[PDB]
Enzyme design. Structure first.
Site, PDB file in Angstrom:
ATOM      1  N   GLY B  29      45.291  83.640  25.307  1.00 41.73           N
ATOM      2  CA  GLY B  29      46.654  83.147  24.657  1.00 41.73           C
ATOM      3  C   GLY B  29      47.845  84.050  25.080  1.00 41.73           C
ATOM      4  N   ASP B  84      41.542  89.698  20.520  1.00 38.93           N
ATOM      5  CA  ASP B  84      41.938  88.122  20.706  1.00 38.93           C
ATOM      6  C   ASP B  84      43.187  87.961  19.861  1.00 38.93           C
ATOM      7  OD1 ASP B  84      41.878  85.584  21.558  1.00 38.93           O
ATOM      8  OD2 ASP B  84      39.806  85.085  20.943  1.00 38.93           O
ATOM      9  N   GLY B  85      43.647  86.695  19.970  1.00 36.65           N
ATOM     10  CA  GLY B  85      44.960  86.071  19.204  1.00 36.65           C
ATOM     11  C   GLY B  85      44.207  85.404  18.075  1.00 36.65           C
ATOM     12  N   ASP B  87      45.524  81.455  15.694  1.00 33.85           N
ATOM     13  CA  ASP B  87      46.530  80.342  15.329  1.00 33.85           C
ATOM     14  C   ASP B  87      47.035  80.840  13.956  1.00 33.85           C
ATOM     15  OD1 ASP B  87      46.781  79.007  18.122  1.00 33.85           O
ATOM     16  OD2 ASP B  87      44.707  78.641  17.437  1.00 33.85           O
ATOM     17  N   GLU B 106      35.493  82.072  23.139  1.00 35.38           N
ATOM     18  CA  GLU B 106      35.964  82.956  22.212  1.00 35.38           C
ATOM     19  C   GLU B 106      35.097  83.237  20.981  1.00 35.38           C
ATOM     20  OE1 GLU B 106      40.927  81.961  22.560  1.00 35.38           O
ATOM     21  OE2 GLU B 106      39.821  81.179  20.687  1.00 35.38           O
TER      22      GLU B 106
END
Ligand SMILES: [K+]
Ligand SMILES: [K+]
Lengths: 224, 227
Positions: B29, B84-85, B87, B106
């Site tokens: 991302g 990690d990102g 949402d 992921e």
């Protein structure tokens, strides 16, 4: 072969004009499809078939049976397939031939499911036949280690030449050599909740009717 | 802009958790982009020694272009930290991921990881999940049928498309259906329903996973210890 042929012939009595029919795989199903083509080409039976495989599609089409893709029909009335094992509680292991995923996708769309088998497929408890599990390739070694630690005796499925088998969806199969599966619903829940497990070969609360080939002829058993 | 500066801020702050000898899972991302850039800086300009494990072909391309060593997940016996990102992150630290279409790898990496850290700009913090459509990764064969089941279930599905209008294919060559749910009050129940559907490979709810969240705020990064 004798038992398989009487059962395949008997099974097509369940097919009715107007039906959409799921057609599975195996030597047993092959006899059924031949007997279905017989009815289509002599008796004017009108039906459309959906298949779990290419080999069956090509057999059905050579007999003049119309085959459509699963997403081209709005319902399937009845799917007729084989099974590797069927327990006393009418739970199944399938995917010995590596197509457990497409078989389950067709079975789930189907209003009714019939399995046709010789006597040797009927067992008290599941588990002598290794349970197949379809697994995403990336991280599949780690999934295999989780299964080894849990005590499931995993083995990756190989092609005849010893390379890893790739399924229709490009995944691997890990077979679990369990011996006896007293609680298949608990095991199925464990497996489907593991990251990277796409589907497993326990077909639970699916089959409605079973036709068993015995030395004295076909026996019909109602499951659900 | 302000949002890129917040993403830059948390991606730089995140690489402080990285120490020589660690095996690090690398997310996917636009925010992770800054983190992988920062990590590359520490590797090429500070001699930092680590091995990365990727969650997408895109991130592996970026990490390789920077000289970060990448090993397949099955070649490492443990992962120390994954960064990690996300949402959306709810007030009880549950996440929706998969906006970048990499939810499956992921989740595979996160599951091997000893610790999981998510890095986000403040806009990602929600009270309840659900305004952001939930991604679901689906087997192509039978995926029209799955779409119709979701439609009948009232889940407002939409297939994921590329910018040209063709269907998106994930790294594992599956499709994604995004569910326009609005609000998800019981994500565990919803996750259980989705994973039990035949043809569903994985879904974008990441529940009881994240340990640490770094949030980029107007007054700087806030480190939140979730679990
Ligand atoms: K799964
Ligand atoms: K599933």
């Amino acid at each position: 072969d004798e038992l398989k042929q009487l059962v395949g012939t008997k099974a097509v009595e369940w097919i009715k004009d107007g039906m959409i029919v799921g057609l599975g795989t195996g030597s047993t199903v092959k006899y059924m499809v031949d007997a279905l083509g017989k009815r289509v080409n002599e008796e004017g039976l009108d039906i459309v078939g959906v298949t779990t495989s290419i080999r069956t599609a090509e057999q059905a089409k050579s007999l003049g049976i119309v085959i459509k893709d699963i997403d081209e029909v709005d319902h399937i009335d009845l799917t007729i397939d084989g099974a590797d094992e069927i327990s006393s509680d009418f739970q199944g292991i399938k995917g010995g031939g590596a197509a457990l995923l497409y078989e389950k996708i067709v079975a789930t769309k189907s209003n009714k499911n019939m399995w046709i088998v010789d006597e040797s497929k009927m067992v008290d408890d599941l588990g002598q036949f290794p349970l197949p599990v379809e697994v995403i390739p990336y991280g599949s070694g780690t999934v295999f280690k989780r299964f080894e630690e849990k005590g499931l005796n995993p083995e990756f499925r190989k092609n005849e030449d010893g390379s890893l088998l790739h399924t229709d969806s490009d995944n691997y199969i890990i077979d679990l050599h369990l011996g006896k599966i007293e609680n298949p619903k608990e095991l199925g829940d464990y497996l489907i909740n593991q990251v990277g497990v796409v589907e497993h070969g326990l077909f639970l609360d699916i089959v409605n009717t079973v036709i068993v080939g015995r030395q004295d002829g076909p026996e019909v058993l109602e499951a659900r």
